[PDB]
Design a protein around this ligand. Structure first.
Ligand SMILES: O=C1C=CN(c2c(F)cc(N3C[C@H](CNc4ccon4)OC3=O)c(F)c2F)CC1
Lengths: 47, 96, 78
RNA sequence: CUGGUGACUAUAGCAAGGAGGUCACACCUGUUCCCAUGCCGAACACAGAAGUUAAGCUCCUUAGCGACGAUGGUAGUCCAACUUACGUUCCGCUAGAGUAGAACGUUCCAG
RNA sequence: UGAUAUUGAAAUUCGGCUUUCUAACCCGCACCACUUAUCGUGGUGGGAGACAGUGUCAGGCGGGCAGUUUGACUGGGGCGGUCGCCUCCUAAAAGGUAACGGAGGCGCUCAAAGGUUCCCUCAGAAUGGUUGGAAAUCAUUCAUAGAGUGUAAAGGCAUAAGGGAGCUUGACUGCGAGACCUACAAGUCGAGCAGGGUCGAAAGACGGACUUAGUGAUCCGGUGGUUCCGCAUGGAAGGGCCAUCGCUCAACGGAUAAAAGCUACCCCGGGGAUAACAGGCUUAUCUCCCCCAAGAGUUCACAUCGACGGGGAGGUUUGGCACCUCGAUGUCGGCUCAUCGCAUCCUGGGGCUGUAGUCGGUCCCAAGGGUUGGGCUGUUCGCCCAUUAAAGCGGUA
RNA sequence: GCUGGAAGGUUAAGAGGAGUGGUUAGGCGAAGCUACGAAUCGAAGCCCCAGUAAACGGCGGCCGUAACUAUAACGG
RNA sequence: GAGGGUAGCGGAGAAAUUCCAAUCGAACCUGGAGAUAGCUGGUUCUCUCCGAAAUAGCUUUAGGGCUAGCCUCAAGUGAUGAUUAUUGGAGGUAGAGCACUGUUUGGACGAGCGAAUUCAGACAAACUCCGAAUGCCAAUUAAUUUAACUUGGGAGUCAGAACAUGGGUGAUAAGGUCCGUGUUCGAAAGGGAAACAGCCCAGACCACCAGCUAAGGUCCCAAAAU
RNA sequence: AAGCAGUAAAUGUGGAGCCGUAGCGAAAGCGAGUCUGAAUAGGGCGUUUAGUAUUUGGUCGUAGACCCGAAACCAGGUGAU
């Protein structure tokens, strides 16, 4: 039931991540605050 | 042959590529310039007939692995950042 | 006319790795275990999987810590 | 013969009975003031004339249950001889028993 | 079976399948000439006709024919079962260690079941109750953890790793002294430094989860980013590098993108490293003897019979093992000729009787000599007919 | 398996040339030349509709019950 | 009877895998050709020094191969090797025990009274409040000893056997089978066990009509006490 | 080295060519330093750095490759006395 998800930056340089996800428990795209290597600061992700 | 087990080269992956326009140079450190006369003019045409450079591949580049010990004027294609620092410190002047 | 058994997992090399009174370095493994059968002491850390390692250079010392409990420590050599 | 804070395998415990104080610990009467409860100003923290050793807490006594336990034997056992189960020489249990034991105690605050 | 070339006309017709006409092409059709032979060529009639036949391209059917594949372990081989990873016992108090030895589990899950700060503490509850086949809920004491800890087991955890309540995304980027493990490839732990941060008053903690299973080279292809290369030059097409994806490749170190059976018609190279017959070791099973005496036999354990349980001998049965023989040790039942053991079928000599006599039962000593002829089945066995003083049992490849 | 049939579904070359890229005369970019493309038209065959066994092949199980008292002519 | 026809990716067959020049499930001759063989057999003179393995991991792998482990020859670095005494530590086997999880004998006490109460007596590879003898890791500690390690050249080995001892398996059967530990054979002559690779004593450089011993022996065969 | 002159002598000529003196990186490139990285912060591989030509011995590779031996496969021919 779980799936692989990739997190990209929000309208800036893309420094992606990879995690897991449950479709039913979270039927919509998620958002988190991660590190952006290019920008050198915390930034919100999605997808 | 490993008797049936996968060979090491098959296990490992390939890497890199080759460039068709690869240019190489014949290096000559500041140590091989201690035989010419003081103030003489050194030119690739001379280094290939004096006995320092046996085969000039694509030009002569002068490096700085050592001291010059003389004041000369050198003519080459490329100079190391430290080769010209010590060539102009003992007198004279280099040129491309 | 068949067997239902016959399975087993690879053996892990658990136990102590250095002896008491021996000289070690800053990152030497001292004891591999499941859980905490021996507790860390002075200048000792517990790894993620309960592995005990030193943090400085000195002699190893296995001592008792309370009734029915053991620890391991490291003291700099003078 | 006190309070505070540490060191050590309960020989530091559990019980049972006794004694003691308003200088200190507690109990203690309040919820306007900061903060707190998935009923209880119950706990947490508080604002603080009195009321009292009944318990918390202590220094004193008692070996009842737990705890600590040599000496001497026994089982087992390394080595070496016989031979299969018996000799010899080092180590040395468990259990049980005579027994210890109702703590020892650094720095520290004021007496 | 379609498209197109060879291949040209006319009309019907809600860049066209179809009636339609001669001129290409076709006729083992007729009459003539070469030629008093009809193979062939040529000419004139007839038939057919832009079809057929022929070339290239495409789709389907195709053991008719061809090249090949069809695993290993295994108390012989088949059949059955098994193949990777995790935990425990066997394992002989370091680590490591086998069998088709004894027991289970895995091919995940969780956006809070993660990080941080402050709080808290469980089963079972000798009794009371709005009294519902004593155990839902509430109340007070016994309570050495007998509760829990996503999921097997074993080591750990009440200084909590177990429960609840607030804010959070460190389930971060670039690495990394030194160690464990180890044939290789892989796997495991890690102080500390720089860049960002979250929680806390602050020390300080944080590079997922109490710990250990939840996974698979490379080669090739896809999707993003980018310092780089890009055939004379400037671009491009294609490559390199970083991130990531797609395999019950489960025979799980994975032969290829793609694979099943029979041979009594059989062949070659090897093995007693490995079966069928005889020998050998073994004695479960088999055959034959003993111990105890509860009871059957009118009374009466012991004339004779012997439940429950126990101890031996023999090496004739069916097996276990795989030590000799696979550059070869020929089967079953007879026939012919015998030999030898005694656990004695007959003949000889003795006890005891539940022995009147005539006949028997059982047991001891005795191996000198004897121990039939036929019917039915290939037989051994076995049954039957008629006899005999008796129609004994075993060994010798 | 063979024979006949046609309503529809699916399906090759070939025909068809929307539209998207790489180049440049003058972040756009008309032409020319170039590397690739879709709507739609393309037959048999196979799914479908029938017929054929002196074609290949196949032709049941458990209960109770007499005027046939063991049995089961009958019924479930 | 004579003269003719059909030829091996083929002929012939009133059909048997039947025949095609004395062996046809696919004729004969020459060539590719010294096809290939992880399988058998064979492999030629002499001395000197040293001297194994029959194990692990992976394998379309199991009587084959590869790396590691044991052998040998050189060049190097220096007590880093081995045994013993002593002081330290880690680790739950033998035995023992019933405090936990089980299994289980005989009584006593009324909560429905032989195993979640009490008084006695037992049992366990997957039970432990306890717990050895040994072995193992250390201390540039002490004495006696002679190795050890690194780099490079060349190998062989991957079928093992019996005896003692701690275990599984089988039936507390096997000269059975699979692991731990030591010895011998393998590759080891000599003496003893009548004969007898694995048992006991003991390791052959050569020669001698010299002596002392081990295992085992001393009436005769037959050296030694009637 | 080929070639040229020499007795099939093995000498003289012949300097295209090969190895060494400098590494690091996939590459552009830089250079006693280079790669990774925002950062000589740390780490990896180098600065240890003698070489080269001929030849005896040992081993390996491509050729039948220490010797003898198949059951078979394909090609072109000879046979119905
Ligand atoms: O039903 C039976 C099954 C096989 N049996 C058999 C046999 F009868 C003889 C021998 N052998 C082998 C050896 C070589 N003999 C031969 C003969 C031909 O080839 N080799 O000599 C023998 O005795 C064998 F092993 C058996 F299993 C017994 C009878």
């Amino acid at each position: 039931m779980r799936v692989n998800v990739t997190l990209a930056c929000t309208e800036c340089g893309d420094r992606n991540y990879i995690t897991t996800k449950n479709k039913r428990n979270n039927p919509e795209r998620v958002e988190m605050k991660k590190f952006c290597s290019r920008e050198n600061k915390q930034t919100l992700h999605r997808e | 042959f490993e008797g049936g087990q996968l060979p090491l080269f098959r296990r490992l992956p390939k890497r890199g590529f080759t460039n068709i326009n690869r240019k190489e140079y014949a290096i000559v450190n500041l140590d091989q310039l201690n035989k010419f006369e003081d103030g003489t003019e050194v030119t690739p045409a001379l280094l290939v007939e004096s006995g320092v450079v046996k085969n000039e591949k694509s030009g002569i580049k002068i490096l700085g692995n050592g001291s010059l010990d003389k004041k000369l004027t050198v003519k080459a294609h490329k100079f190391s950042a430290s080769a010209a620092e010590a060539i102009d410190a003992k007198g004279g002047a280099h040129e491309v | 006319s068949s067997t239902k058994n016959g399975r087993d997992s690879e053996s892990k090399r658990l136990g102590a790795k250095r002896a008491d009174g021996q000289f070690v370095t800053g990152g030497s493994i001292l004891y591999r275990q499941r859980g905490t059968k021996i507790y860390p002491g002075e200048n000792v850390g517990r790894g993620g999987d309960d592995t005990l390692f030193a943090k400085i250079d000195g002699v190893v010392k296995f001592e008792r810590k309370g009734r029915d409990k053991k620890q391991v420590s490291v003291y700099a050599v003078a």
